[PDB]
Protein backbone atom coordinates (compact mmCIF):
# COMPACT_ATOMS: atom_id res chain seq x y z
CA UNK A 1 0.00 0.00 0.00
CA UNK A 2 2.68 2.42 0.43
CA UNK A 3 4.53 1.58 -2.71
CA UNK A 4 1.97 2.60 -4.88
CA UNK A 5 1.65 6.19 -3.53
CA UNK A 6 3.92 8.31 -5.68
CA UNK A 7 3.78 12.17 -6.20
CA UNK A 8 0.38 12.12 -7.80
CA UNK A 9 -1.26 10.34 -5.34
CA UNK A 10 -0.09 12.24 -2.39
CA UNK A 11 -1.46 15.63 -4.37
CA UNK A 12 -4.64 14.12 -4.86
CA UNK A 13 -5.22 12.70 -1.63
CA UNK A 14 -4.13 16.08 -0.18
CA UNK A 15 -6.34 17.89 -1.82
CA UNK A 16 -9.35 15.78 -1.10
CA UNK A 17 -9.07 16.31 2.89
CA UNK A 18 -6.79 20.09 2.67
CA UNK A 19 -7.41 22.05 -0.28
CA UNK A 20 -10.52 24.78 0.64
CA UNK A 21 -11.80 22.73 3.63
CA UNK A 22 -12.89 24.10 6.90
CA UNK A 23 -10.06 23.59 9.58
CA UNK A 24 -10.39 22.98 13.17
CA UNK A 25 -8.86 25.24 15.63
CA UNK A 26 -7.83 25.21 18.95
CA UNK A 27 -5.45 27.82 21.19
CA UNK A 28 -4.15 28.19 24.30
CA UNK A 29 -1.43 30.20 25.95
CA UNK A 30 0.09 33.89 25.04
CA UNK A 31 -1.68 33.62 21.48
CA UNK A 32 -3.13 36.89 20.81
CA UNK A 33 -1.27 36.51 17.73
CA UNK A 34 -2.91 33.54 16.73
CA UNK A 35 -4.44 34.56 13.19
CA UNK A 36 -8.20 35.16 13.28
CA UNK A 37 -9.93 32.40 11.42
CA UNK A 38 -10.99 33.83 8.68
CA UNK A 39 -6.86 34.53 8.06
CA UNK A 40 -6.59 30.49 8.98
CA UNK A 41 -9.15 29.39 6.46
CA UNK A 42 -7.81 31.41 3.76
CA UNK A 43 -4.62 29.91 4.33
CA UNK A 44 -6.27 26.64 2.90
CA UNK A 45 -5.60 27.55 -0.66
CA UNK A 46 -4.24 29.82 -3.01
CA UNK A 47 -5.19 32.30 -5.59
CA UNK A 48 -2.12 31.55 -7.46
CA UNK A 49 -3.80 27.52 -8.20
CA UNK B 1 2.77 51.90 14.31
CA UNK B 2 1.42 48.79 16.93
CA UNK B 3 1.68 45.22 16.30
CA UNK B 4 -0.52 41.81 17.79
CA UNK B 5 1.42 40.08 20.36
CA UNK B 6 2.33 43.44 22.14
CA UNK B 7 -1.06 45.10 22.41
CA UNK B 8 -2.17 44.19 26.44
CA UNK B 9 -2.72 41.56 28.56
CA UNK B 10 -5.56 39.15 29.07
CA UNK B 11 -6.00 35.87 31.09
CA UNK B 12 -8.20 33.07 31.59
CA UNK B 13 -11.11 34.14 28.85
CA UNK B 14 -12.03 32.01 26.28
CA UNK B 15 -13.43 32.89 22.53
CA UNK B 16 -15.80 30.11 20.89
CA UNK B 17 -15.87 30.74 17.24
CA UNK B 18 -17.73 29.10 14.19
CA UNK B 19 -16.51 28.86 10.61
CA UNK B 20 -18.28 31.15 8.03
CA UNK B 21 -19.22 27.87 6.12
CA UNK B 22 -20.94 26.17 8.88
CA UNK B 23 -23.25 29.00 9.60
CA UNK B 24 -25.87 31.54 7.83
CA UNK B 25 -24.92 35.59 7.00
CA UNK B 26 -28.67 35.90 7.29
CA UNK B 27 -30.02 34.51 10.70
CA UNK B 28 -33.11 35.62 11.50
CA UNK B 29 -32.55 39.10 9.92
CA UNK B 30 -36.36 40.06 10.55
CA UNK B 31 -37.50 37.72 13.34
CA UNK B 32 -34.70 39.75 15.21
CA UNK B 33 -33.65 42.79 13.15
CA UNK B 34 -36.19 44.55 13.58
CA UNK B 35 -37.29 45.05 17.54
CA UNK B 36 -33.37 45.33 17.84
CA UNK B 37 -33.68 48.32 15.38
CA UNK B 38 -37.01 49.68 17.68
CA UNK B 39 -35.00 49.18 20.80
CA UNK B 40 -32.38 51.09 19.78
CA UNK B 41 -34.55 54.36 18.00
CA UNK B 42 -36.56 54.10 21.03
CA UNK B 43 -33.44 54.73 23.18
CA UNK B 44 -32.29 57.79 21.61
CA UNK B 45 -34.75 59.67 19.63
CA UNK B 46 -35.67 62.08 22.99
CA UNK B 47 -32.05 63.55 22.64
CA UNK B 48 -31.89 63.38 18.67
CA UNK B 49 -35.43 64.53 17.89
CA UNK B 50 -36.14 67.46 20.00
CA UNK B 51 -33.39 69.99 18.46
CA UNK B 52 -34.70 68.83 15.00
CA UNK B 53 -38.23 69.50 15.73
CA UNK B 54 -36.99 73.35 17.18
CA UNK B 55 -35.03 73.64 13.72
CA UNK B 56 -38.28 72.36 11.84
CA UNK B 57 -40.39 74.96 14.05
CA UNK B 58 -38.57 78.14 13.12
CA UNK B 59 -37.76 77.06 9.71
CA UNK B 60 -41.70 76.68 9.27
CA UNK B 61 -42.42 80.56 10.95
CA UNK B 62 -39.36 82.16 9.45
CA UNK B 63 -40.60 81.41 6.12
CA UNK B 64 -44.37 82.25 6.89
CA UNK B 65 -43.22 85.58 8.26
CA UNK B 66 -40.87 86.18 5.30
CA UNK B 67 -42.88 85.07 2.01
CA UNK B 68 -45.78 87.75 3.81
CA UNK B 69 -43.63 90.54 5.04
CA UNK B 70 -43.78 91.82 1.68
CA UNK B 71 -47.13 92.09 1.16
CA UNK B 72 -49.15 95.03 1.01
CA UNK B 73 -50.84 96.51 3.75
CA UNK B 74 -53.83 99.25 3.09
CA UNK B 75 -52.11 102.18 5.07
C1 LIG C 1 -5.31 45.83 -9.48
C2 LIG C 1 -3.89 45.26 -9.37
C3 LIG C 1 -3.95 43.75 -9.00
C4 LIG C 1 -2.64 43.30 -8.34
C5 LIG C 1 -2.71 41.77 -8.02
C6 LIG C 1 -1.37 41.27 -7.42
C7 LIG C 1 -1.27 39.74 -7.64
C8 LIG C 1 -0.20 39.09 -6.70
O1 LIG C 1 0.52 39.78 -6.01
O2 LIG C 1 -0.07 37.65 -6.67
C9 LIG C 1 0.07 37.07 -5.35
C10 LIG C 1 -0.99 36.00 -5.14
C11 LIG C 1 -0.45 34.90 -4.22
O3 LIG C 1 -1.52 34.42 -3.39
P1 LIG C 1 -1.55 32.88 -2.90
O4 LIG C 1 -1.31 31.93 -4.04
O5 LIG C 1 -2.91 32.61 -2.29
O6 LIG C 1 -0.41 32.65 -1.79
C12 LIG C 1 -0.43 33.48 -0.65
C13 LIG C 1 1.01 33.78 -0.22
O7 LIG C 1 1.62 32.60 0.27
C14 LIG C 1 1.00 34.86 0.87
O8 LIG C 1 -0.29 34.86 1.50
P2 LIG C 1 -0.55 35.75 2.80
O9 LIG C 1 -1.34 34.95 3.82
O10 LIG C 1 0.78 36.18 3.40
O11 LIG C 1 -1.38 37.07 2.38
C15 LIG C 1 -2.71 36.93 1.85
C16 LIG C 1 -2.91 37.93 0.70
C17 LIG C 1 -3.03 37.18 -0.63
O12 LIG C 1 -3.53 38.06 -1.65
C18 LIG C 1 -2.58 38.96 -2.22
O13 LIG C 1 -1.39 38.84 -1.97
C19 LIG C 1 -3.08 40.08 -3.16
C20 LIG C 1 -2.05 41.23 -3.28
C21 LIG C 1 -2.75 42.61 -3.25
C22 LIG C 1 -3.41 42.93 -4.60
C23 LIG C 1 -4.19 44.28 -4.50
C24 LIG C 1 -5.46 44.25 -5.41
C25 LIG C 1 -5.74 45.66 -5.97
O14 LIG C 1 -4.08 38.70 0.92
C26 LIG C 1 -3.85 40.08 1.22
O15 LIG C 1 -3.25 40.38 2.23
C27 LIG C 1 -4.34 41.19 0.26
C28 LIG C 1 -5.48 42.02 0.91
C29 LIG C 1 -5.73 43.33 0.09
C30 LIG C 1 -6.56 44.33 0.93
C31 LIG C 1 -6.73 45.68 0.15
C32 LIG C 1 -7.99 46.44 0.66
C33 LIG C 1 -8.31 47.61 -0.29
O16 LIG C 1 -1.35 35.43 -6.38
C34 LIG C 1 -2.60 35.86 -6.97
O17 LIG C 1 -3.58 36.02 -6.28
C35 LIG C 1 -2.67 36.11 -8.52
C36 LIG C 1 -4.13 35.99 -9.07
C37 LIG C 1 -4.73 37.40 -9.42
C38 LIG C 1 -5.72 37.35 -10.63
C39 LIG C 1 -5.46 38.56 -11.56
C40 LIG C 1 -6.62 38.77 -12.55
C41 LIG C 1 -6.11 38.68 -13.99
C1 LIG D 1 -7.34 41.93 -10.10
C2 LIG D 1 -7.54 40.93 -8.95
C3 LIG D 1 -7.03 41.38 -7.55
C4 LIG D 1 -7.12 40.31 -6.39
C5 LIG D 1 -7.06 40.83 -4.89
C6 LIG D 1 -7.19 39.73 -3.74
O1 LIG D 1 -7.69 38.67 -3.97
O2 LIG D 1 -6.89 40.10 -2.42
C7 LIG D 1 -7.10 39.12 -1.39
C8 LIG D 1 -8.63 38.92 -0.91
C9 LIG D 1 -9.05 37.39 -0.89
O3 LIG D 1 -8.01 36.50 -0.61
P1 LIG D 1 -7.82 36.01 0.85
O4 LIG D 1 -7.82 37.24 1.69
O5 LIG D 1 -8.79 34.91 1.10
O6 LIG D 1 -6.37 35.46 0.86
C10 LIG D 1 -6.10 34.25 0.20
C11 LIG D 1 -4.84 33.55 0.77
N1 LIG D 1 -4.51 32.31 0.05
O7 LIG D 1 -9.51 39.76 -1.70
C12 LIG D 1 -9.97 40.98 -1.15
O8 LIG D 1 -10.75 40.96 -0.25
C13 LIG D 1 -9.10 42.28 -1.41
C14 LIG D 1 -9.89 43.55 -1.93
C15 LIG D 1 -9.11 44.51 -2.89
C16 LIG D 1 -9.76 45.89 -3.18
C17 LIG D 1 -8.86 46.91 -3.88
Known sequence: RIAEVDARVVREVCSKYFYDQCPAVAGFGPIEQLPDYNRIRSGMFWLRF | ?75
Not at chain 2, 10 to 19: A, D, F, G, W
Not at chain 2, 43 to 70: D, H, M, N
Open chain 2, 1 to 75: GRQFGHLTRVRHVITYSLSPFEQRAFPHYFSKGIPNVLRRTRACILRVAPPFVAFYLVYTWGTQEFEKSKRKNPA
